[model samples]
Target: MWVRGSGPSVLSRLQDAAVVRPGFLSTAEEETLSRELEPELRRRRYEYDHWDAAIHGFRETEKSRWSEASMAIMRRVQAAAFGPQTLLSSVHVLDLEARGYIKPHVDSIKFCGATIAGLSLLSPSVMRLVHTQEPGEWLELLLEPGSLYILRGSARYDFSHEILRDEESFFGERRIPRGRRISVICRSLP
Candidate 1:
């Protein structure tokens, strides 16, 4: 069973893992990737003007130099945490405007018994992993600009998560324009 604090040895082992840092890229890498990604972003004919679009198959959707690299890291992490039976069912990217936020929701059933892996990139945001036991028994995590956070064990089954843009999150910044966010989400099917 998963507990408060650190998870089992397996997960703890992955805590300090060396997956390529999210958001951060070498100057050369960033310039090259930026050039590669710009064309695709401009091609999105159906832009969700609001902040609630859950983009699926993010890797397949854009021409990003980081897409393949990110997926490779996710695959290795999944293999270490769950095993070879896992498959990438879907991936999504959340782009929130300043003061835009997500309500508390659980990611479950759709992926069967698989866990939800989240890689946070671009900017530091507050992601809350909440509890169903009580109204706000939650773990508030600050996902740094280039880090990762995963919802495994009870987090996937027993709890929920919400990305909140609290008043303080604004920090006097107007229209908290989010940089391009990408996620390499996967699931275990069969």
Candidate 2:
């Protein structure tokens, strides 16, 4: 179970080293963004080390750079989640179908800044962040449709993160199925 912080915003909950804000976007906003991205999806290959088929699944995913419309939405999110001081320099739009996943990995600090934020669209999935040394110790954050999450501090440096490929996740007796998820990732450039 996830623990809640004092505030009502989705970022109120502190899980591991990241902060989550559920329902950061309204239903209309979510639908609009998802619809706008439909024609832009394309499959791409990513090269990385320490990747496992079990963890990342075998499906190929689509990726796109931010368009002007997408950037405008992200800038609003950045201003609300972060202040005007932290300007995000890079935006990556990803399209993941059912059974597609992201392997556990850390963003290179040399190329990126300390903070990473992602806006979930279309569907919901579970994101896991594991301790760099103790792999067994981890935290799972649910990426609900229209939810926004910011990972900073230790969450960016001390742990590796991944989105599981499993079709369903169990939270006690409740089962949650993974669906098509579109992620808009924003980060600072070093």
Candidate achieving the largest TM-score: 2
| Ten contiguous residues with the weakest lDDT in model 2 | 2-11
Check candidate 2 and list the clashing pairs. 10-20, 10-21, 10-22, 11-21
Clashing residue pairs in candidate 1, if any? Answer: none
lDDT of 1 at 59: 29
| Model 1 stretches astray by more than 4 angstroms | 1-38, 45-71, 166-182
Candidate 1 local lDDT, 119-142, one digit each (tens): 554455555555677654555455
Could you tell me how far off, in angstroms, the CA of residue 172 lies in candidate 2 after the best superposition? 5.6
Question: Model 2 segments beyond 4 Å from truth?
Answer: 1-17, 42-72, 84-89, 171-173
> What does candidate 2 score on TM?
0.75
- TM-score between model 1 and native: 0.59
* TM-scores of the models, in the order given: 0.59, 0.75
Model 2, 123-176: lDDT tens per residue? Answer: 777777777887655666777888888888777888787886655464323455
